[PDB]
Amino acid sequence: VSSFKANGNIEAKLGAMSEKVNAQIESFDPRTIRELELPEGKFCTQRSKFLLMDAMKLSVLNPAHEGEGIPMKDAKACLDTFWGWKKATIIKKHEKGVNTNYLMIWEQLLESIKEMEGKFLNLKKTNHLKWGLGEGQAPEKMDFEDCKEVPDLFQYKSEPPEKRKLASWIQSEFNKASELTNSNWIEFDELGNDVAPIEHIASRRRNFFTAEVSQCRASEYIMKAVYINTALLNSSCTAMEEYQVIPIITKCRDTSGQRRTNLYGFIIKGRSHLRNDTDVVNFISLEFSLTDPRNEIHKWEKYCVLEIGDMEIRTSISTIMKPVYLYVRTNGTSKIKMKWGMEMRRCLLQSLQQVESMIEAESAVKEKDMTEPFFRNRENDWPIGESPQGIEKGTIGKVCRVLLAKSVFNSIYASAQLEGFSAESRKLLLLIQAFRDNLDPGTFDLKGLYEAIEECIINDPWVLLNASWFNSFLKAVQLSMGSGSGENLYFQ
């Protein structure tokens, strides 16, 4: 090493090395490339911790603020508004589970709520509830010596996840998440007073953002997640041995100004000796709905749906009678998953800084605050969907709520599949962008990238839908271009 001198060493070996060792640039044209292949299988079930578009609320008018009053007292206030409870009957079974336990849990809960006299409710450890919360279902830990010779002693099932097909429902869920509602779901805490002109400008723009985001349906889901996961984490820690009841509550204000407390159902926490950040808490969710589960039975694989009542619903000029279902299921979460659920309000930040950068990007060019024009005019609009008529464009407000829904759904349906899919497909998008910028892109192993992407599309409804969304985007890009040596790079 001390006496080494260069004398064409690399050059020599480059001659010596096989010419199979190379990096051939294959030119990349997105007209050439195929759609991502989505997996076949049984359909993907709903896997959220709470009902999304299928939820139903019992509510009360209530001057209380965005998280005020004792939960179970508020919960009973919401139950007393509704009469016409029926004898409960199973209308859709949980095929893999003992369904009369689910039925007995509901009847036990309802009765224990009626007989509660306190701030909190801990249920008695009955057999039906013990089964529903996995009491005693951990195999007993032994030394290896004592069990070495057992025949069926194997290592734990460590296969890849079972594939599942893209179902209609997840696209439907996302559409509803992007909608406006008649209620302000998010109350924001105070700032210091505005002094700088830029702080006044900010507040003016923040007024627009705040309404758009607070009234969006995705924000309702944010508030359910922040409530549920906070309640579960706190009770998981403090009441480790108790089967504690947590009512699913949110608070909101109308467009009309009236403050309101909503009740969606109940959650029964199992035991919660949570040591590792992945350690599981078993719970049972019992959630109201008007959705008939038989119309889309693949959505509800994990649920046992009861028919628990009848509701007289008021409309334009006709009272309608609809049956009231109760979607029951066993479910689970962890300290880490609860932590991130408690933090779901950051989804607001993801959407809004993308939107504000768009407003700011034009403001730079136009040399004026384009906040007011963007929200109030309809001259500026971005593609955000497909109807049979074609590619539908939305305003900045719509874009904001779609981006908020995306971020919320990334939080509700977080997975290694999504992580992998998002990271690898970003490369393919950037190649498509490079081509559309007239920058002559090139791949080395395009088949390998497709495999990296497609490997991650296994069984998750959200990742499945994002894969579909990429193909729809790919197809839309191909059409605006078409054949030719000088294709229309510009959209419309």
Binding site: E179, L180, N207, F208, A211, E212, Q215, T255, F375, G397, K398
Partner: peptide
């Protein structure tokens, strides 16, 4: 500001 949508 009250947001609206075609819906």
């Amino acid at each position: 500001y009250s947001p609206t949508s075609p819906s």
